Amino acid sequence: APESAKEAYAWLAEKGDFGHFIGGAWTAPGDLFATVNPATGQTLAQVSQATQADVDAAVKAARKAQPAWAKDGAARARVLYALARLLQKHARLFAVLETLDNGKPIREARDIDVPLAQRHFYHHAGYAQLMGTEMPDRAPLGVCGQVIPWNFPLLMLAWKIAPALAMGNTVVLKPAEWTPLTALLFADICGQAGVPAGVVNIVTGDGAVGEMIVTAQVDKVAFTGSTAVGRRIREATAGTGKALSLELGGKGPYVVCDDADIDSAVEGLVDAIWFNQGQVACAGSRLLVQEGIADVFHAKLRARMDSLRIGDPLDKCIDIGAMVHPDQLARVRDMVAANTDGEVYQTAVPAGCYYPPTLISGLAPASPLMQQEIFGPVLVSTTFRTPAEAVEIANNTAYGLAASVWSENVNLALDLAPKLVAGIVWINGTNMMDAAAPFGGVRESGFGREGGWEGLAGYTRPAIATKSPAAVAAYTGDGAADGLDRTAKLYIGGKQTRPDGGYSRAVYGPKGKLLGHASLSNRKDLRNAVEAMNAASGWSRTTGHLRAQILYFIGENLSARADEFANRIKDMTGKDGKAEVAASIDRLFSAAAWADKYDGQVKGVPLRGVALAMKEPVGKIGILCPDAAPLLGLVSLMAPAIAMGNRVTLAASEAFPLAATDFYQVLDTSDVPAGVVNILTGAHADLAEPMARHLDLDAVWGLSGHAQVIEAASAGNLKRSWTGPFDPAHDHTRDILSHATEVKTIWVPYGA
Amino acid sequence: APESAKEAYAWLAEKGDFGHFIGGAWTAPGDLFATVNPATGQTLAQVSQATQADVDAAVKAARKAQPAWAKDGAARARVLYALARLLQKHARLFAVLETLDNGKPIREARDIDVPLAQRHFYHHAGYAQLMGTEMPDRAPLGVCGQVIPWNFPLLMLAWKIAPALAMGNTVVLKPAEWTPLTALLFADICGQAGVPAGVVNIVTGDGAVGEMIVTAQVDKVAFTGSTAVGRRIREATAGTGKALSLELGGKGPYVVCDDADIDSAVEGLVDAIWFNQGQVACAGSRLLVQEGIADVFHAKLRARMDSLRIGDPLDKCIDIGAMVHPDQLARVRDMVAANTDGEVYQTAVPAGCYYPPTLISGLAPASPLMQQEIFGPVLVSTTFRTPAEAVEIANNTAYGLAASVWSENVNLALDLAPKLVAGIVWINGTNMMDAAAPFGGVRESGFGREGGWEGLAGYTRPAIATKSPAAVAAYTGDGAADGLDRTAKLYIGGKQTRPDGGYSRAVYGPKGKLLGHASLSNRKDLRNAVEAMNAASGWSRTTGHLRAQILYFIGENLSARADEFANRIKDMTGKDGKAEVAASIDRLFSAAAWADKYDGQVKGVPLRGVALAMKEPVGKIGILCPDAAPLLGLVSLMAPAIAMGNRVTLAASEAFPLAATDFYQVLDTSDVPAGVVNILTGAHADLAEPMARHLDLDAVWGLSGHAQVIEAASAGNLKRSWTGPFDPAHDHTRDILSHATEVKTIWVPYGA
Ligand SMILES: CC(=O)Oc1ccc([N+](=O)[O-])cc1
Ligand SMILES: CC(=O)Oc1ccc([N+](=O)[O-])cc1
């Protein structure tokens, strides 16, 4: 007999038609639309489509409540703990309501969704308690606008609300149009938990309401959902100064080596067929099986698939529930109808809201379906010959979120895991989640991390605000001919090169004296620099010891020319340059120091083993330097970036380019490998959009303005972006290390 | 053709008879004794036996130089980097001199000893650079007295001097009597590196000179050597306020499972035979082989041992050098002569200063050789049937330093590693060392860690001093009989218990009002508490989440009785108790927060894989609370200790015991597992020595005085000790987490 929904129905009846939860109170129901149980077609409740005025009021209430909420972290901790206690007390109600609203099996809702939501609040309460003492250099961002998908309604809510509240922010959150009910129940327990009025605001509606929230006067936007919508959100927030995190697409590859525990790998896959829907950090949808075991693996997988029970989601014996909505059923049907490759195996005939577990096997490594978007309870599979080929297939995508690797050999499993492009890799498991273990994407899977200490940075700002120096116009001057050869070039791929466009501008000092000429770089020069960075990919695999040695050489070699660099700075700016040179040397030595000291973090989890939140390079970074600090600005951004294993191309100070061109000889003398540091000079209006747009750059740092253009263009490949503030006079090294790294969490067996 | 020693002989001829290196200068040669090349028997140089006056002068010069040296971390980083560059430039000289002085093969000196010493200085330079910004809460200790053994003379020097200088301390270091030369060459390069006069002082001599240094006016003593000497150093420094680190005995077990890569495990072990001598954190000397592979493993081991080349250590093809001194040769011969068990395999007949690689196999798990000290190039081996038996055998020692585990299976290797009592565990390797990876012991292998961020705490003090409150004499009263039942008891093993001795004292308020009676605990009560903590060993294997939940309950249940506890405090002290109760609740919630957030640190290393510097519980801690803060002192020490997975026995405030006895109900209502928290009341003069002596306690925290008695008694089992300062009104939570944890560094394969 299925679980009783009587208490869920009673709550829905008490709530009647829903308005919104704004300023601690329930508003009048407005423009109502039915929310439907997908398993039965029956209307569960009427829910409102929020108006622009509703969003405005929600944001105004969050803004009003934020200063007093921010003031006492211990008080926030008690509230987060109370919320966790209420989720636990009402766990059966939350679980039944989630099944009624979304269609998922009640067994998943009770055993996974609700317990993980509870633990997220329990765990994050402690971050509120410790923020003042352990993060004293950090402060809240303010108001967060948050948008979540329909696949895990309550758990997605927890992943958004818990860290935001812990760090002293208030929230305006919209649940997915199809699944509002558990978010409304969460709203309904906020008063009992002591959530002060306006600290949590929940508004309901379609994507138009999501766009209203994203474009509202919020300090942070956090979104989980499709990559296509993430691009639109990046564009709609470009130039606003908003903090932005995106958890996007990329259902993960599942690599099964010849020496895997076959039966366990099969069981983890079958247990994930229902889970791996919508946008969530998961693995198993793309199956990569080594040739030697492929036939036995598929035979076992089909047999285990046949045992999955499809039906009434309120029955705790059911494994496969109802599809969330008829539009999602149509998506899966259409995907199947459009595919012509492979062999299709389904355990049942599709009937009503129930789509059967489906395996599409026999695909080639380059088939469209291995890389195309997947809908429904569907797995696609291919084979591989060698572990190196598995890595190649797994990484042959625009995505990089979660992945799973199966092997019984301790050496092979730990060799494969770090080579996968991903923010999460599970060894001998899949879909393992904990509040202490960060998760998030690289590439087109987005950016930012949710969970752990690592997730808190994205909900905070520096406690002491820095300000980027104002732009400086280049000096003008006479323009007489130069009979000497004083025309500086570009530095690309370990050698000087002429600008592709052939042009240079005269550089004058503060009194109008001609100092020399500097090249005007173009998009072709940038293309050449990116090619050089691609050739230097081995730098991203060097040891920290080696990178430290190089940075020490750079510092020593600049020190040997310190007087000369101070003189060049004074020639260009009219101000003594000794202090800027000393600071630049210091930045190099601090970056050298950090190159082998920026440690990953080991997470104890209440699951099997440990989660290793590793630090890895971002990859290739294009950087635009400020006008001020002609040497220190360049060195301050270059040095931490290469210390962390990235390759960089920097557009030097537009106004004062000749300190950076003098720096070419320092790079050469220091044996900086070709392509690790490339330097362009010239007009940042020519370079900002090409650098932010470039599909082969992993991050763009624009510290000379053009923030809107840079952030909008970054949506092409969803590269990370940083547009300041950046004050070169201040030591930003540690903060820059975070801009210069990604967190990759590897889950490993561990006997403690 | 052996390596040329011409330059080494020329340096020795230049320096002639040696004095000491004090205040930046070489002192006159004094009471001279020959230092002898063990391979040839020839005198290399005459070296002085330092006098008390020499030690005093070295300490005085170190003290004079320290304040200026502390001021500028960037300047120290330049000096440390210059020392590393000098070790590298002169690497061939350092390596030859090490071989001449100590007898080790030149191949080891060139490939291992000198490179690791260079790397230690390169790496630690960066900590000097970063100390001001990344460790702003820390300051230098002052002057460090440092004593090192003869097995790795230069490398042992680097492990001592590099962190000490990085943290702004100055040093007085004595090399081992038998191997002074590379330390004297290190002294001779200090001027060239820019070491300010007196920042490094090197004095030579025997153990009497070592004792002079340890008992001198130094702030820190750091020693590597025998456990027996470590005990004497702990006794000689007891009650002086000196920081102390000890890296002692315990050559490590080498666990070879049935599914190990046998050839790799054999090659790793044969390559370690020469290395595993003296006191160093190594593994291989105690071979534990699973029964199924024991015969094949030993057959391969004997064959590979036969390939080791013994002879002139200046020949780069040589694997087994000369024993360091005839006294060490006698030690190994006598050990072999004393053994009557097992089967002795030696690859050659002993001859001159050369003792052959030796395998003593077929021993029972409880054989004299399996547990007693090992000398020479000697391996001892036993077998095991199950991995659980391997763990029992490996842990059946008074030691816990390094260990190695060999298995190809991902589960078994990572399951065995946390179960071993050790500060270092290598998976599928041995003797892996890096400047960023901490190493150190538990149990009778000592305490403290060398290397990494983790090693720096032992070379620093809090920048802001805390002061322990003055003792408070209990109030007196008339002595009338109490017609009511107000005699508090003890709390041991989950229940209240009568004091074994049967005595209680009257407790009076400030004006003489009888408040009740409190038990006078005795050594038997402590014994019962220790037995209860042993029964609660499962607490040390719980999840952080579980421990957080318990601490949250304690905080909630104290909150529910807040007025009652404030009233009890005011009854006893005459001062309002509300703020003390509020602080106590805060400490509980901060410890709850930390219980699942005190993360281990992942070290990138230039070797194979990664090193995981994990946090583990200390185990069982005995704690003596101050008189002041009758509730807050107890709660502040208890809460972070249990949050980190320890079990504790606390002696409550002697003057004001009744807040702690009221707290028994809070523990019971909060479902604290039996034996995790035990509380004794009574006179700390009765309890301090028994707690510090107890051989079944892993640490003693004495925050009520008795520092000399506690520190001297702790030498029995070399338990960790903390004798303050401790101000209950100060939030010590973060520092207490460090007192309450050990660092265990697990080296694992990794493909990045
Ligand atoms: C801000 C923007 O450009 O578009 C959006 C479209 C839809 C949603 N949504 O709620 O799914 C959010 C944002
Ligand atoms: C301080 C003390 O009690 O004795 C010592 C004996 C020997 C040494 N040593 O040079 O190895 C150091 C200290």
A497: exposed, middle or buried (Cβ count in 10 Å: 0-12, 13-18, 19+): middle
**Atom number, ligand 2, closest to the C-alpha of residue B214:** 1
A206: Cβ below 6 Å to ligand 1?
Answer: no
> For A494, left (φ over 0), alpha (ψ -120 to 50), or beta?
left
Residue among B178, B229, B327 whose CB has most ligand 2 atoms within 8 A, to mutate: B229
**Atom number, ligand 2, closest to the C-alpha of residue B207:** 10
Taking the CA of residue B233 as centre, how many other CA atoms within 13 Å lie in the half-sphere pointing to its CB?
33
Residue ID of nearest Cα to ligand 2 atom 11: B207
Is the torsion defined by CA of B364, B368, B370, B376 positive or negative?
A: negative
- Nearest CA to B424 out of B264, B231, B247 is that of B247
A558 CB contacts (<8 Å, ≥6 apart)? A565, A581, A584, A585, A588, A635, A663, A666
- Nearest CA to B110 out of B93, B124, B122, B128 is that of B93
CA distance B565 to B575: 12
| Nearest CA-CA distance, residue B178 and chain A, Å | 33
Residue ID of nearest Cα to ligand 2 atom 13: B211
- Taken in order of first residue, the domains within chain B and their CATH numbers are 5-249+455-462 (3.40.605.10), 252-454+748-748 (3.40.309.10), 487-747 (3.40.605.10)
- Nearest CA to B611 out of B435, B407, B459 is that of B435
- Nearest CA to B453 out of B743, B37, B229, B36 is that of B743
B225: Cβ below 6 Å to ligand 2?
Answer: yes
Ranges of H-type helices in A351-451: 368-371, 387-394, 410-416
Residue among A55, A174, A224, A233 whose CB has most ligand 1 atoms within 8 A, to mutate: A233
CA distance B659 to A610: 39
Q: Which amino acid is at A147?
A: V
Instruction: Match 């014994």 to its residue by tokens.
Output: B527
- Nearest CA to A199 out of A453, A450, A459, A21 is that of A21
CA distance B354 to B274: 12
Instruction: Match 């919630």 to its residue by tokens.
Output: B589
Residues of A whose CB is below 8 A from B544? 436, 604, 606
Q: How many CB atoms lie within 10 A of CB B326?
A: 12
Rg (CA), chain A: 28
- Nearest CA to B662 out of B681, B684, B641 is that of B681
Dmax of chain A from CA atoms? 95
Q: How many CB atoms lie within 10 A of CB B498?
A: 12
Residue ID of nearest Cα to ligand 1 atom 4: A211
User: For A406, which residue in chain B has the nearest alpha carbon?
Assistant: B410
Q: Which amino acid is at A732?
A: H
B292 CB contacts (<8 Å, ≥6 apart)? B258
B137: exposed, middle or buried (Cβ count in 10 Å: 0-12, 13-18, 19+): exposed
Identify the helix (H) or strand (E) that includes residue B346: strand B343-346
Give all strands (DSSP E) within A410-494, no chain letters. Answer: 424-427, 446-447, 460-462, 490-492
Cα of A67 from ligand 1 centre, angstroms: 28
Resolution of the coordinates, Å: 1.5
CA distance B539 to B644: 10
Identify the helix (H) or strand (E) that includes residue A85: helix A73-89
> For B646, left (φ over 0), alpha (ψ -120 to 50), or beta?
beta
Ligand nearest to the Cα of A240, by number: 1
Residue B604: which of A419, A436, A596 has the nearest Cβ?
Answer: A596
Residue A450 tokens, joined = 């949710």
Cα of A162 from ligand 1 centre, angstroms: 22
B345 CB contacts (<8 Å, ≥6 apart)? B302, B305, B358, B359, B360, B361
A725 cis-preceded (ω within 30 degrees of 0): yes
CA distance A619 to A717: 14
The SS3 call for residue B154 is: helix
- Determination technique used: X-ray
Kindly state the DSSP code that residue A453 receives in the 8-state scheme. G
CA distance B399 to B391: 14
DSSP string across B503-556: -EEEEE-TTS-EEEEEE---HHHHHHHHHHHHHTGGGGGS-HHHHHHHHHHHHH
Kindly state the DSSP code that residue B351 receives in the 8-state scheme. B
Residues B562, B665: contact at Cβ < 8 Å?
A: no
CA distance A670 to B110: 26
Question: Quick check: A123 and B599 CB within 8 A?
Answer: no
Beta strand pairing call for B720-722 and B699-702: parallel
Q: Is B373 annotated as a binding residue?
A: no
3-state secondary structure A152-191: CHHHHHHHHHHHHHHCCCEEEEECCCCCCHHHHHHHHHHC
Q: How far is C-alpha B694 from the geometric centre of its chain's CA atoms?
A: 19
The SS3 call for residue A507 is: strand
Residue B414: which of A74, A596, A748 has the nearest Cβ?
Answer: A748
Residues A200, A120: contact at Cβ < 8 Å?
A: no
- Angle at which helix B181-190 crosses helix B6-15, to 10 degrees, equals 70
Q: Which of A541, A599, A734 best probes binding to B when mutated, by most B CB atoms within 10 angstroms?
A: A599
How many residues appear in chain A?
A: 752
Instruction: Match 């992945």 to its residue by tokens.
Output: A403
Question: Quick check: B133 and A586 CB within 8 A?
Answer: no
Identify the helix (H) or strand (E) that includes residue B43: strand B43-48
| Nearest CA-CA distance, residue A422 and chain B, Å | 14
CA distance B539 to B546: 10
CA distance B412 to B392: 15
Residues B616, B742: contact at Cβ < 8 Å?
A: yes
3-state secondary structure B675-721: CCEEEECCCHHHHHHHHHHCCCCCEEEECCCCHHHHHHHHHHCCCEE
Per-residue burial over A283-301, b = 16 or more CB atoms within 10 Å of its CB, e = otherwise: bbbbbbbbeebbeebbebb
Residues A220, A242: contact at Cβ < 8 Å?
A: yes
Question: Quick check: B544 and A129 CB within 8 A?
Answer: no
Cα of B230 from ligand 2 centre, angstroms: 8
Question: Quick check: A129 and B603 CB within 8 A?
Answer: no
Residues B745, B437: contact at Cβ < 8 Å?
A: yes
**Atom number, ligand 2, closest to the C-alpha of residue B237:** 1
DSSP string across A388-410: HHHHHHHT-SS--SEEEEE-SBH
Q: How many CB atoms lie within 10 A of CB A222?
A: 28
Cα of A332 from ligand 1 centre, angstroms: 23
CA distance B67 to B169: 9
Q: Which amino acid is at A320?
A: I
B307: exposed, middle or buried (Cβ count in 10 Å: 0-12, 13-18, 19+): exposed
> For B674, left (φ over 0), alpha (ψ -120 to 50), or beta?
beta
CA distance A91 to B506: 51
Instruction: Match 């009520």 to its residue by tokens.
Output: B704
CA distance B451 to B568: 48
Per-residue burial over A305-333, b = 16 or more CB atoms within 10 Å of its CB, e = otherwise: beebebbbbbbbebbbbbbbbeebbebbe
Cα of B229 from ligand 2 centre, angstroms: 6
Beta strand pairing call for B610-617 and B600-604: antiparallel
CA distance A737 to A643: 8
CA distance B290 to B390: 8
DSSP string across B285-314: EEEEEEHHHHHHHHHHHHHHHHT--BS-TT
The SS3 call for residue B371 is: helix
Residues A289, A262: contact at Cβ < 8 Å?
A: no
CA distance B544 to B595: 5
Residues of A whose CB is below 8 A from B537? none
Residue ID of nearest Cα to ligand 2 atom 7: B207
Phi and psi, residue A321, nearest 5°: -95, -155
Residue ID of nearest Cα to ligand 1 atom 5: A211
Ligand nearest to the Cα of A176, by number: 1
Question: Quick check: B751 and A419 CB within 8 A?
Answer: yes
Kindly state the DSSP code that residue B18 receives in the 8-state scheme. B
Dmax of chain B from CA atoms? 95
Identify the helix (H) or strand (E) that includes residue A441: none
- Nearest CA to A675 out of A509, A505, A494 is that of A494
CA distance A378 to A273: 7
B232: Cβ below 6 Å to ligand 2?
Answer: yes
CA distance B745 to B739: 17
Kindly state the DSSP code that residue A419 receives in the 8-state scheme. G
Question: Quick check: B453 and A599 CB within 8 A?
Answer: yes
The SS3 call for residue A717 is: coil
Ranges of H-type helices in B103-150: 106-108, 114-134
Q: In angstroms, what CA-CA distances link A71 with A76, A341, B581?
A: 9, 59, 22
B154: exposed, middle or buried (Cβ count in 10 Å: 0-12, 13-18, 19+): buried
Residues A277, A103: contact at Cβ < 8 Å?
A: no
Q: In angstroms, what CA-CA distances link B440 with A684, A736, B246?
A: 53, 33, 8
Rg (CA), chain B: 28
Residues B458, B245: contact at Cβ < 8 Å?
A: yes
Residue among B146, B147, B220 whose CB has most ligand 2 atoms within 8 A, to mutate: B147
CA distance A31 to A41: 21
Taking the CA of residue B469 as centre, how many other CA atoms within 13 Å lie in the half-sphere pointing to its CB?
17
Identify the helix (H) or strand (E) that includes residue B603: strand B600-604
Residue A749: which of B123, B127, B411 has the nearest Cβ?
Answer: B411
> For B574, left (φ over 0), alpha (ψ -120 to 50), or beta?
left
